[PDB]
From Swiss-Prot:
Annotated organism of origin: Drosophila melanogaster (Fruit fly)
Assigned protein family: Belongs to the protein kinase superfamily. Tyr protein kinase family. Insulin receptor subfamily.
Domain-related comment: It is unclear whether the potential membrane spanning region near the N-terminus is present as a transmembrane domain in the native protein or serves as a cleaved signal sequence.
Domain of life: Eukaryota
Protein name: Protein sevenless
Parent sequence residues shown: 207 to 269 of 2554
Length: 63
């Protein structure tokens, strides 16, 4: 129950950092989405895809 707490804490902190740092990085195509677009071009959807795909890469030894 400590391990899931570590999983949910890292997932909460990852989704919180992708919410915070969406306007920080200038993307290479010049994306600049808004705070509530939730579309596939934006930083937040790709970054929450990164915080969705970290645990499955760790068990199955994917980079």
């Amino acid at each position: 129950v400590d391990e899931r707490m570590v999983l949910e804490r890292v997932t909460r902190d990852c989704v919180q950092r992708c919410i915070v740092e969406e306007d920080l990085f200038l993307d290479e195509f010049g994306i600049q989405c808004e705070k509530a677009d939730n579309g596939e071009k934006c930083y937040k959807t790709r970054c929450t895809k990164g915080c969705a795909q970290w645990y499955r890469a760790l068990k199955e030894l994917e980079s």
